[PDB]
């Protein structure tokens, strides 16, 4: 009978992947690490760190833990400091969703939010505010997960021995996502100390990060990636930092959850792809132990959601099956399959009236058609674009009252209404917008803004 | 005691204008013609026309009058055919407002509406439908106010004699708006028959019409103007067709109502301006009798409304007084003086997120500013325009996930917030949109579309 | 050649009504008075009043005319003071529409608006503000159309003589709307002075006014009616104040415009109905000269509009023809003939969920039906009314989580969907709302609020 | 090195609760069961069931698994049938959220949704559709988790032995949530077979279910509860079914996650409360092993969300701290702290106009105040309620045109604007709505519907 829930942190199993790695390649054992009571791998470091603050006497009993959290370290820190009874207060960037910090609260942590995207060194970003809280509050102890030797030491104590024992001293490689830099350092250091120099440590890094040799970048895979060299990552340990893209990592995570029964996150997919790559230059008899460090339940609406995964130019395929059943006509069915009367103007109306219709119906383009009856057979006289009108009106090139026929641009190209949205993207790749001619007659205009707004919701 | 209300049609007074004509010029007598019981001058022709259908036996008792109406001829035709008891049915273009045809109904006329802007010779325009009604109904009699000699004959009988008698055979000129062509023909013909060739007939025509020698045009002044030669306008009568613009005619109508106590319409202002012009080449001792043919009560929301009169690039000044106490900041106060926190993005957000904010807030431009706190002192890093983004995203020049800082355009110019809207127009005459820096900090972006949308409502 | 437009004020014709008065009754001559250049009868008094201010020296040249206007007196005052050149400034209640005061401005009058419905004797109503303007401005002259003897004197001079001459001293009665009290006083006084006591003066008054013996009332017919005794109405003149209702006056105005070719207003209809009534107790050989004092062009959207005329429980019939073609189902077609899915709940859902659906869809009643498929054949289990739920929830009689089946009221009655809206009114006269069963299945619920909201727009 | 991820299902730890159980009571060991690879306890049964279909030859290789899922059994069934390679297809009620079935898909399961709340025995509910799928598809095998002996047998094999071994044959009681009825049956049967009759099995059941002796009820705690007797629950095993309410279970779950570092669900809280209750009649030396069967990550927005937890009359306190900082005035700040103003009417306006304002502003009550200036000092003349008006208007008791002062109800009571929302609830408990008098003047009316709409969002 365990004494607290934070005593079961460790000894996580070591299962193997048998359907993602190709045939004729070494063994890939994925050290599933989302079975910890805290949900992620960060629990390991958490425990160790707290222990230090009790041995070094640097965290007097009843003191408060202050920390600029990421979302996973907070979970473990709360889960443990709640056993000891230390009040915990985080300072989180508003970039974190409501569910994540709601969990962070449910564990008994006080989360004070501050704006984001501001420079880290100014009073707005959460680093300076965390320092200010450290000053004001008494008995504060900023664990500083980025420059804390205990971080990597904890993995050196209780992540290498598991890797070395579950395989019986037979592990050719050890690939692991390198984020803030504790898992690879504290694990590879021990794997090398206990195997001479046999097991070559490899570290996967999101494409275009500091470790991978590139410059900064906006990062999507939560966890891995950095813009500076953490004080707790000795760059001498890893032997090959194999960088991997973002689309590849997300697709690998999805395919892993679908073909191996593991709900791993983004960094997990990145690590698995880095492995499956390194597992080629190591022929048969190779044993690559990847470190899947998260559980893919928090991302359930972030990378398993075809909508989000499609907004960021991603989503090779859909989770359930067939690819693109929706056709361009459905882009027009925002009113529940209710293609409204083709907002149209005639070669005799007034430029002011054309601008009026454009403003009143929200649309930004309209085919001037020679018959108010919306039944024209592809013989629309021209096209009027609100931008072009406003330009010709504010540059004296067209009086407000002038007839529209003297300032209308050439007609805009046409695409069928029963054609797939991928074809619509391919087409709009070259023009600004185009009218959908549904069995002879036009029924509206699909435009870049509208297509890219539809992709991001359905 | 008159027998019917349609017996008082005629003998309308002849008042003179004494504040619009400059000093040192002849006398200008304006034959106010909106005192007829039917409201306009068309009553004259109406009566005559009906009489013909009773003498020529071409309108059997109990028959129906069918006519593609304009709005004034309908009033007189109803007012008279209601005395005789003839059912009247009009076919009106939807271009006519609700008040006009509502009046046309209140007199007991049946108005059947058809779409407009369609060619006159097709089954959609009201000419063909009027002919179809003439066929179907029995005893129909299409008066055809455009090719009816009785039209001009009525003015020859009861509009020249009034002009010739109220002035005692002393009239140098007779200027009159020339629309469908009865008032000038039937009046000048008599003025010449009874004065040899002394009184030189002049006819005003809206700028760019058939009579003025130009080609077709979208017409705003209701009444005057045409696109073809009516069969009832003998072009030999008028001696000088002095064409006048639209802004000039509207301004003259407004100034006439303000400085002469006459609520005349648009054609009235056109005729008065044509007079005031011809009254220069006729030195002292000239007596120009203009024919103001309408009453400016129907246009009360069409040319006396600063909003409408400003949408069509018009409105030199406002009715009441000072010019432009508008200011550009008020363009931002669409939420009741509630500047909207300035939608912005930062040099680190994702292109997808910038497009997201643009779509979500409706705005089409946004300043990328290096601090989420909306307090920047004119040091915004750049500007992002939804069009430019969507272009760089659908042309492969920018991944959806790429940082915005790599695809942001140069900053957009600035204008004060306490500056008049005329200055805003002068500025936007050269750029696409500009941010209003209100005492150091920016508070939004005013754009061509927004300014031209505000002018048309306030 | 008149010298100014305000010289033609007077001598308005005297036409007779020959289709509204029944058979076997005296002659009814309606002194049409909307042919004055200013549009209404008030011009008469206006002229006279101004003359006084010039003879009595009480209005020094260049002085300003201040007046709490009604809408017609302003027109005449502007039309004349613009001839003299006196700056005119009105103070109008916000109850006046935009078109009326827009006209009042177009004539060159400065209209300063103040809130309405406030007591007349306080600084908010326009009487006190008019007095304040009289104090501040110099040379001000508040004509005070309510306590000015010149008002009735003007009609005594130039409205009785016309009535007495156009009929050749043969007029049995003279009925005229009695509003502020000048037309009846100044006309009947002369008719009696010049006919001994023969011509019995009659005065029509809106039902429930001071003159008719009743108490105050909210007045709709613009003009006639008062809440106090004006200082310029000698109650000894009129011999019978025959009060008339509002619906009767509006219907008489409409029928007059349709069967006599006169666009008279509301007071005109009231006067005509009062006449047609008095013309019964005066057998053959009676000559009743009604005084139609307004022109029905300003009300074109106030009493000739079936929408407005129907909101105030009016509108016996429609202007054009057949009565009530719209059927109850069209009340549901607010989404363009798009029945809204029939928001429903089931006997197992939670009271919280029922309140949720009610709030989310705006509706206030919903039939609990035993099958989510909206195809039930009139076997809906019950009805839930948001009010009843909220009551049973805030009075502890139903937990938020309790099943709805324990707090649902009896079903609400049903009416067909192809039945006329008049039937719907007759039905809702007894219940709170009822579901429209369209050929077996229900398709929604029409409610008092919805029906009375539809009547007021279509 | 495990062979598949579904080999680690079992041997879940047995941690003890040391802060929720009061002092002077036996030991409470909570067999945390959310550490299974599939997330919940259902994995156990899942494995066993699949094994049967392979030994009994009742699931031919390549066959499809059809099952009307709940949300947890689906996870385990997918996780295992994906190891064997059996296509899995679920039929889920639309009551399940998007995240749950999205997870269910990510594992490679085909989820076909059908409407809910329909009777289970009809073709609309998912039972009949599941049977239809069993018929159509080939090799189908409906596991039927409700009438499958293997269900309870699996817990008999691998849930009792763990309970009996982790405690060394020393367990006085075994309390466990009783839902579909496998955990208590298959565990208590073994605990009794191996301990004579010592360990008294107890089973917690949501208040008002079949097992607890009550009738049906709408159930909120996902999992536990039933409306019929499952064919796989032998009611002879449990010795005391201690029923527990819903609010109690949710509060216990929240307090457990906050004071024991366990994110358990709803059934977990119910089981823990049932334990903490039974642990009173068992003095010192008692060892109650509760069975927490779920992980509280899916409910993160269902019971840890103060909004949802407050809509269903719940939420004793908030997760973070102080109770009700929001005051009634904030209920009015739906427009971002911008009380619209104070829609009002005056004792002279028309009933039609009062109904008009009510309809136009959405509000359902309005104080008739004797001064349009919204500055009245608590001297509002009356109150008008749209319902009352519409009633008095459709029952002939008030003409549309009648003055409002004759049909206005007594004023509605007042409450301060800086008072807490709990006070507002206490007040509205007795009236229909009340106006908030903010430092003397009124600033609006808060109504039951508005308060209960605000509670459900903030
Ligand atoms: C913490 C974390 C990692 C590993 O970070 P380290 O650099 O090893 O400390 C990987 N993925 C995710 C999602 C993480 O949160
Ligand atoms: C009819 C009309 C005229 C005169 O038209 P004619 O060509 O003389 O028949 C001028 N102005 C308006 C507004 C008219 O309606
Ligand atoms: C002024 C007016 C009257 C007549 O008012 P008096 O009391 O005669 O001065 C009648 N109807 C209307 C619409 C009016 O404006
Ligand atoms: C399955 C389940 C249980 C236990 O159900 P049994 O009746 O033991 O089969 C308890 N809680 C939840 C949330 C469950 O899903």
Residue numbers in the entry:
A (entry chain C), B (entry chain D), C (entry chain B), D (entry chain A): 3 to 460
Wording from the paper:
We propose that the oligomerization of MtbCbs requires initial association of the monomers via their core domains to create dimers, which subsequently associate via their respective Bateman modules to yield the tetrameric assembly. The 3D structure indicates that the dimerization and tetramerization interfaces are stabilized predominantly by hydrophobic interactions. In native MtbCbs, the active site K44 is buried inside the core region by a flexible loop (G40, G41, S42, S43, D45, and R46), making K44 relatively inaccessible to the substrates. This indicates the formation of internal aldimine at the active site.
In this study, we resolved the full-length structure of MtbCbs in its native, activated, and substrate-bound conformations.
